[PDB]
């Protein structure tokens, strides 16, 4: 009906007008008075050399020492990063995995991919082996991200345009978030784990309430598919890296884009983004085989992590902020300090 | 400088390393084929010869083949096609009888053009199956090729029409040097399609070995 189309157009115009009214000064104008962090020199302290294919995801344990990594050789490897020892190696039923999660308690890990199933594996069993605790099915597209809320609750994003909050005890979708129009590629949980942001292929990100399930706000501005999303440590902002070779920082309360991190040299898209412990550094993995450490406040390239011979696919920062792990499309993970 | 527990942990890590190495060696001896088509093209029959992604394992002359039919994956192909960067070959199935309408033949043509001229599948070879040759013959005897191809100069002969379609598909290749296209005419036929696949992947493996040595 034309009346619905006109109402939607006027509502979008009102949203744009309200956002413009709430904007008075760009974050760069306010921030430029502060001292730049200078050149950020980081060296490869450790190199994890166990995988045999492209590494697609990695996640840090909450103890900032154990990390789980997934590659398309059908293996989930739990590494002790301090000693480069392999704590665990789990054979996956489906070798096509694009996501990987570590439970905050450290008892479980999660995996998923082109098989449209989120597999939860129990790491702490009396039998002494890692076994599949539960397979969650109900997504009609590939699983792109999964994040543990606790030992019993997980939230998954899929290429079937929808997100789902599950219940591992029963394996049923407790909540379904359906607001996107393209494949959802990333997922970031808020520090309080009551909200989460999802970035999809319609060049938009959406903020969902976990408790009941609603798209509270929608953030646009990207020119292509958003591949990565990460919450600011404060929890009042987030950053999205997309295929148009740019990262963007949005603010929840302002409901607006705060900053754009881009450079004319960079023409390749971003595969992963993460923040430092204080939020001053925004780390972004690129397809040009390098990672860029941006000054999240001043939008300047504070440093470059150039140690990978292929596209950097996954990137994470420890909970204590001591190190950053990057996994790329070669079979190597690197720890930087 | 390592305590007893640290030494035992290192030993366990080395055992895990050995198991991973053995698993990777076993996996590297497997031919990975990416199966593609336009739905009713006839992928089901080809799979018969030998929710998300579907895997088919078979064996031929002591060679282990893994065929990955991503055919009920109705998402953005660009977001997951790079996962198959590195397969031995792409088996593309097209129905010769699907040139009637509902355009289908052109749909297969555009899908083949998109797959062949891809950044990831720059060096991967494509085994092209043109199946349902009997229904193609039956349709040709009654209706001409001109509905699908207005700029076609030929009679209602099976051989000439089939050859014209084959070259029409083979001209979609842009990188006609680094990638080779193998064409077979199929039809719910004798086991000759598995032999054709084996021959094509043998050629691809010879080329890959020559690349590895470095002469190429």
């Amino acid at each position, epitope marked *: 009906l034309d009346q619905l189309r006109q109402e939607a157009e006027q509502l979008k115009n009102q949203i744009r007008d309200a956002r413009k009214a709430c904007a008075d000064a760009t974050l760069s104008q306010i921030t430029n008075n502060i001292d730049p962090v200078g050149r950020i020199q980081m060296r490869t302290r450790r190199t994890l050399r166990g995988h045999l294919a492209k590494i697609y995801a990695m996640h840090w344990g909450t103890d900032s020492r154990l990390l789980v990594s997934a590659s398309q050789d059908g293996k989930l490897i739990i590494w002790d990063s301090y000693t480069t020892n392999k704590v665990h190696a789990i054979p996956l039923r489906s070798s096509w995995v694009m996501t990987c999660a570590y439970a905050p308690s450290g008892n479980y890990v999660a995996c998923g991919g082109l098989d449209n199933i989120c597999s939860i594996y129990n790491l702490k069993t009396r039998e002494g*082996n890692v076994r599949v605790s539960r397979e969650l099915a109900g997504h009609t597209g590939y699983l792109s991200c999964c994040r543990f809320l606790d030992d019993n609750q997980i939230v998954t994003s899929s290429g079937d345009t929808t997100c789902a909050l599950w219940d591992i005890e029963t394996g049923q979708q407790t909540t379904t978030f359906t607001g996107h129009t393209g494949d959802v590629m990333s997922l970031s949980l808020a520090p309080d784990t009551r909200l989460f942001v999802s970035g999809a292929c319609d060049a938009s990100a959406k903020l969902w309430d976990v408790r009941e399930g609603m798209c509270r706000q929608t953030f646009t501005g990207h020119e292509s598919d958003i591949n990565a999303i990460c919450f600011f440590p404060n929890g009042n902002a987030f950053a999205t890296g997309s295929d148009d070779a740019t990262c963007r920082l949005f603010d929840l309360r302002a409901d607006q884009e705060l900053m754009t991190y881009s450079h004319d040299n960079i023409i390749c898209g971003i595969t992963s983004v993460s923040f430092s412990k204080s939020g001053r550094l925004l780390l972004a993995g690129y397809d040009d085989f390098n990672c860029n450490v941006w000054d999240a406040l001043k939008a300047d390239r504070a440093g470059v992590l150039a140690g990978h011979d292929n596209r950097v696919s996954c990137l994470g920062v420890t909970d204590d902020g001591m190190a950053v792990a990057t996994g790329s499309w070669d079979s190597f993970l690197k720890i930087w300090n | 400088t390592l305590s007893a527990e640290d030494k035992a942990a290192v030993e366990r890590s080395k055992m895990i390393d050995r198991n991973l190495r053995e698993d990777g060696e076993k996996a590297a001896r497997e031919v990975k084929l990416l199966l593609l088509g336009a739905g009713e093209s006839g992928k089901s029959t080809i799979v018969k010869q030998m929710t998300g992604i579907v895997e088919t394992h078979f064996t031929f002359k002591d060679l282990h083949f893994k065929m990955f039919d991503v055919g009920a994956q109705r998402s953005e192909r660009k977001k997951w096609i790079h996962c198959f960067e590195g397969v031995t070959a792409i088996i593309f199935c097209v129905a010769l009888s699907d040139y009637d309408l509902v355009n289908r033949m052109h749909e297969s043509m555009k899908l083949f053009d998109s797959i062949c001229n891809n950044k990831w599948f720059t060096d991967t070879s494509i085994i092209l199956f043109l199946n349902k040759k009997d229904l193609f013959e039956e349709k040709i005897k009654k209706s001409p090729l001109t509905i699908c191809y207005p700029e076609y100069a030929g009679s209602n002969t099976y051989e000439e029409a089939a050859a014209y379609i084959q070259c029409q598909f083979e001209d979609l290749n842009k990188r006609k040097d680094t990638k080779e296209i193998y064409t077979h005419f199929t039809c719910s036929t004798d086991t000759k399609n598995v032999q054709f696949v084996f021959d094509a992947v043998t050629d691809v493996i010879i080329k890959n070995n020559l690349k590895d040595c470095g002469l190429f």
Partner: single-chain antibody
Amino acid sequence: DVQLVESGGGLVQPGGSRKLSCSASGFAFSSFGMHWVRQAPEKGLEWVAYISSGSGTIYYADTVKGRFTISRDDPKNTLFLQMTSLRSEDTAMYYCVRSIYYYGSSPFDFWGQGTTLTVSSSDIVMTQATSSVPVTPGESVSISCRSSKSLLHSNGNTYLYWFLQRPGQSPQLLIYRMSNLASGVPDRFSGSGSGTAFTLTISRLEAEDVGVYYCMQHLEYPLTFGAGTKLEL
């Protein structure tokens, strides 16, 4: 059901060549390093031998080196201890402890039932001082254990283990690495201390908590135990 069953004990003449077997059922036996730990009748536990996962590493006590041999049959899920030139000092009950080693693991977590064996007729010293203290339900008791060498390693781990042996039962792991409470142990047990001085505290002691408490070091082989403190009343 992570049970370990022991067989091959009995009466052996001196100089005999009796062999003990240990059947494992309910866990991935191939991934566990396995120990033989003996206990003389009126004595405490004493570590005998250890075989790693994959049989790549083997250790023996100085009292059994050259006469004992430990081995595994992983497909059969069995652990063997072949003992030759048996002497009267080898009269003991033998246990078949399992221990897996990775970051955060809890070694020595499960013990077998033990096989009795009766023969006819640089090491770290761990001192447990007190040998018997009477207790009453509801109270809190602190069991002390001193070490000759500092068990605190350069990596931050203090390799001290606390085991409890109830009357007429097999020892069970209470604490591993001096602070971590083993799975299934009630929270009333706690472990603290520093290098060469450790203490296991039982707060609000009750029934089924009486027995002999042993402190063991895993800093280096051979592993050594304390004499044990008995809890009665």
